[PDB]
Design an enzyme around this catalytic site. Structure first.
Site, short mmCIF file in Angstrom:
data_model
loop_
_atom_site.label_atom_id
_atom_site.label_comp_id
_atom_site.label_asym_id
_atom_site.label_seq_id
_atom_site.Cartn_x
_atom_site.Cartn_y
_atom_site.Cartn_z
N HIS B 29 9.46 -11.08 17.26
CA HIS B 29 10.75 -10.55 16.86
C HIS B 29 11.38 -11.32 15.71
CE1 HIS B 29 12.24 -13.83 19.51
NE2 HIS B 29 13.27 -13.81 18.69
N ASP B 51 5.84 -9.34 23.06
CA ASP B 51 6.68 -9.83 21.97
C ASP B 51 6.12 -11.15 21.44
OD1 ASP B 51 10.30 -10.51 21.55
OD2 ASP B 51 8.63 -10.59 20.14
N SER B 103 14.41 -19.53 19.00
CA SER B 103 13.26 -19.07 19.76
C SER B 103 11.96 -19.60 19.16
CB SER B 103 13.23 -17.54 19.79
OG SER B 103 12.59 -17.07 20.96
#
Ligand SMILES: CC(C)CCC[C@@H](C)[C@H]1CC[C@H]2[C@@H]3CC=C4C[C@@H](O)CC[C@]4(C)[C@H]3CC[C@]12C
Lengths: 52, 151, 48
Positions: B29, B51, B103
């Protein structure tokens, strides 16, 4: 008309008590924390999982 | 330590890519460019189901890749931002430790081994729930606590 | 002509016998592909 009503009522009873069987078979899993419902049982009873 | 490569978007840092085992992994992402040219160029593979965004490490000149482990015993682990409490099938973090755009930072066990990769979190109240990507002996899985928004 | 005009399926004869074989084989390939895709999708949903 009588036969159609009787057959439709039988179909409705069948689907409703199938829903009753679904609820009885599913509620204990929805009460137990973790809710590790096997994938096959989820397919058979057509449920969604609580843990995504 | 210091096995983290920055993923920079045009005007800011958006994510973080890590060397685990024989592969470089990044959150799929995160939009941006890998800091290292040999990895930014390297033909790179995408999976949206987990993901996750993979490539094979050029191990001839990347021998510093971190080691991993699929075991997840109960208790405390390290997140480059404090201690994560792995309880049940979830990871819990102090609410002020993580921020969007961070992230891709792996979770370390007490032995320095990567156990899971944070893909995001959920504002959980007294804590925050950590939505991560972990693995079993042979397969990967993604743990997504309810209410988790994207990081 | 004393006979009547004929439709698409009528004139087909052993050419129809042939297109039966060809359609059966290619549709069998399609069905095998569908089965493979379905089993792969079922396995994929078991991994979450
Ligand atoms: C696949 C190969 C081996 C054989 C295929 C043969 C097909 C294309 C041939 C068989 C003989 C042909 C048909 C025989 C009769 C009719 C009915 C007529 O009102 C219009 C033409 C039409 C519809 C022809 C069109 C083409 C046709 C259907």
């Amino acid at each position: 008309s009588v036969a159609s009503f009787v057959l439709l009522s039988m179909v409705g009873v069948a689907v409703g008590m199938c829903m009753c069987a679904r609820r009885r078979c599913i509620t204990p899993y929805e009460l137990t924390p973790g809710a590790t419902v096997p994938f096959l049982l989820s397919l058979i009873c057509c449920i969604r999982t609580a843990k995504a | 330590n210091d096995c983290i490569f920055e993923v920079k978007h045009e005007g800011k840092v958006t994510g973080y890519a890590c060397l685990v085992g024989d592969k470089v992994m990044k959150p799929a992402h995160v939009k941006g460019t890998i800091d290292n040219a040999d990895l930014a160029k390297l033909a790179f593979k995408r999976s949206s189901k987990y993901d996750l965004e993979c490539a094979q490490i050029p191990v001839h000149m990347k021998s510093d890749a971190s080691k991993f482990t699929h075991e997840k015993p109960e208790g405390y682990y390290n997140w480059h931002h404090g201690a994560v409490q792995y309880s049940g099938g979830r990871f819990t973090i102090p609410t002020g430790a993580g921020k969007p755009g961070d992230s891709g930072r792996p979770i370390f066990d007490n032995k320095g081994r990567v156990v899971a990769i944070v893909l995001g979190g959920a504002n959980e109240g007294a804590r925050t729930a950590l939505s991560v990507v972990t693995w079993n002996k042979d397969i990967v899985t993604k743990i997504t606590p309810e209410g988790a928004e994207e990081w | 002509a004393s006979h009547t005009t004929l439709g698409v399926q009528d004139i087909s004869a052993t050419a129809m016998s042939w297109v039966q074989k060809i359609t059966g084989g290619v549709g069998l390939v399609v069905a095998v592909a569908a089965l493979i895709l379905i089993v792969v999708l079922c396995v994929s949903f078991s991994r979450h």
